[PDB]
């Protein structure tokens, strides 16, 4: 496979128009529909301190890396059969990478 970085930029609005709808990547961030992913990159699937997640996402114990996160976002409901990621997903090629890199910019 090839992740490759690319150029966040669009990734910002993308997040703001895709993920942020349910999420945020902010420090004192709420948990609206989905939990804040502030530095998610580094932990495993089901950390937060409040959210408590689904048994699926938890028991998945999947690591969040630019690579793994990619497939997950490409199609999260398939990757985690039981997440409440009610999400469109990032089955593109560029938009996806722009987002992964954006997240890394927003909080590595
Ligand atoms: C609402 C319609 C959502 C959209 C759009 C996105 N996400 Fe989401 N996400 C949502 C929920 C309700 C949950 C919790 C389910 C669970 O138990 O995991 C999630 C979870 C995630 C996770 C996992 C959290 C963790 O393991 O700590 C990630 C990494 C995640 N979501 C990322 C993510 C991104 C980057 C999105 C835009 C591309 C996105 N989500 C959209 C709900 C919704």
What number of helices (H) and strands (E) belong to the chain? 5, 0
CA atoms within 13 A on the CB side of 32: 14
Tell me the technique behind this structure.
NMR
Tell me how far CA of residue 77 lies from CA of 29, 40, 50, 53, in angstroms. Answer: 23, 18, 22, 14
Among 85, 94, 103, name the best residue to mutate to test ligand 1's pocket (greatest count of ligand atoms within 8 A of Cβ): 85
**Rounded to whole angstroms, how far apart are CA atoms 27 and 8?**
20
Q: What is the topology classification, in CATH, of domain 1-108?
A: Cytochrome Bc1 Complex; Chain D, domain 2 (1.10.760)
Tokens coding 94: 């560029």
β-pair partners for 63: 44
8 A C-beta contact, residue 46 and residue 57: yes
Q: Which residues are CB-neighbours of 34 under 8 A, at least 6 positions away?
A: 19, 22, 23, 84, 85
Kindly list the domain boundaries of the chain, sorted by start residue.
Answer: 1-108
Nearest alpha carbon, ligand 1 atom 28: 37
Distance CA 103, CA 15 (A): 8
């Amino acid at each position: 496979t090839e992740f490759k970085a690319g150029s966040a930029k669009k990734g910002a609005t993308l997040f703001k128009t895709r993920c942020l709808q349910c999420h945020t990547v902010e420090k004192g961030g709420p948990h609206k529909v989905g939990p804040n992913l502030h530095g998610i990159f580094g932990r495993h699937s089901g950390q937060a301190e409040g959210y408590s997640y689904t048994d699926a996402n938890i028991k998945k114990n999947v690591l969040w890396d630019e690579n793994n996160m990619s497939e997950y976002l490409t199609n999260p409901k398939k990757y985690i059969p039981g997440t409440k990621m009610a999400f469109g997903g990032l089955k593109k090629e560029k938009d996806r990478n722009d987002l992964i890199t954006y997240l890394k910019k927003a909080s590595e």
